[PDB]
Design a protein around this ligand. Structure first.
Ligand SMILES: N[C@@H](CCC(=O)N[C@@H](CS)C(=O)NCC(=O)O)C(=O)O
Ligand SMILES: N[C@@H](CCC(=O)N[C@@H](CS)C(=O)NCC(=O)O)C(=O)O
Lengths: 220, 220
């Protein structure tokens, strides 16, 4: 049976699960939360351990917590390294990805006065902290993948973040040629290609009106 | 060689690593960051992949990212379940612990005007979302541990959080007898007992002046 993904019809916290399942070549289905009552239904079903989504029905579980879902998917589909040493590298890399992702994820709901400052900070962190660190990993071993010379969730999560960075400002990737190269190679894996092409499961960026709709469903 | 823990002499993001290593019966050492120049030294050493701590030297790695360090320690010392299904439950539980932890962790640096509202929200989440959810897990199987009828990092991380809740307001545990019972059993494991007794590695709560010291070292 295909996993079932419960979320708003948008990127938010479910987008990295879509990318990772897609990258693993796993067909999945989505039940969109379009109304407050769609959300209320999942809570009243007892489906949500913490009264929150993402939730993914997979292998007889109703998994909540984005990290728990990703860890399970990655381990099941051999995208979490070969040994605990490789996992330690993967985990360290993707937790960095997670921190920069979280800043970008919450930009839309930043108090309007400090939004410019927040964009400056994200660009500063992007160019001076995160991308330098990942560029140095690729520089150090000259291999096609971040870890174990093999495709892992680290490649998928980083490449998903490079697309977001490019959407924020394409000049931010200018000084990171090895990361641009990763992005091009990962984008051309058969499974990721289908995911990114027209009609794939990838979600578009939100607008003023998708933000307003999500805010009256989730309260933020 | 004993692991080496690099952090401020305080709880912050390193406290759950201290608990987990202690619970696994692993002797460790700590190099405290007492001054801006202590921090600057780690950055200039190239020790910090993202220019941040926690950092833990263990088994020839300089691991940063609290989750990467915990995932490694838990897997090494057989505290991460027997299979990926048990890890999915463990992960789902501890990610909920992590969300309530994060609210408590940032209380000290909440603007003093909205601190009361923040404490109200934390108590609401504690009594109406998190503790109910963990109480239901123990109720459902009536076993001594949250997962696999066996000690896991889920027990250690939850019992750490129950101590923090008790520090915030002891009446918050009143309606959660099975969680009080877990806290009492876990607190009496030989390794955790030493960790909690006088002269153990457990750190005290911060004060106005430990918060001020950490703020001018880490800029937060
Ligand atoms: N730590 C959780 C965060 C989940 C979360 O914040 N969920 C939101 C939607 S993205 C929600 O359900 N909000 C409603 C609420 O907290 O009541 C995860 O990563 O899964
Ligand atoms: N996601 C990281 C957070 C690390 C973090 O925020 N580190 C702080 C100290 S707890 C720091 O080094 N701050 C200085 C800075 O970011 O420049 C983790 O969980 O380890």
């Amino acid at each position: 049976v295909k996993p079932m993904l419960h979320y708003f019809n948008g990127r938010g916290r479910m987008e990295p699960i879509r990318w990772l399942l897609a990258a693993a070549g796993v067909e999945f289905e989505e039940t969109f939360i379009d109304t407050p009552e769609d959300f209320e239904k999942l809570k009243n079903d007892g489906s949500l351990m913490f009264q929150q989504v993402p939730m993914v029905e997979i292998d007889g579980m109703k998994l909540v917590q984005s990290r728990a879902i990703l860890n399970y998917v990655a381990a099941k589909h051999n995208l979490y390294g070969k040994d605990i040493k490789e996992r330690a590298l993967i985990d360290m890399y993707i937790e960095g990805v997670a921190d920069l992702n979280e800043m970008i994820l919450l930009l839309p709901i930043t108090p309007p006065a400090e939004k410019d400052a927040k964009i400056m900070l994200i660009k500063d962190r992007t160019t001076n902290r995160y991308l330098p660190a990942f560029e140095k990993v690729l520089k150090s071993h000259g291999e096609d993948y971040l870890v174990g010379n093999r495709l892992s969730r680290a490649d998928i999560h980083l490449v998903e973040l490079l697309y977001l960075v490019e959407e924020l400002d394409p000049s931010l990737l200018t000084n990171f040629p090895l990361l641009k190269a990763l992005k091009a190679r990962i984008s051309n894996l058969p499974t990721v290609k289908k995911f990114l092409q027209p009609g794939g499961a990838r979600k578009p960026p939100g607008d003023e009106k998708s933000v307003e709709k999500s805010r009256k469903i989730f309260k933020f």
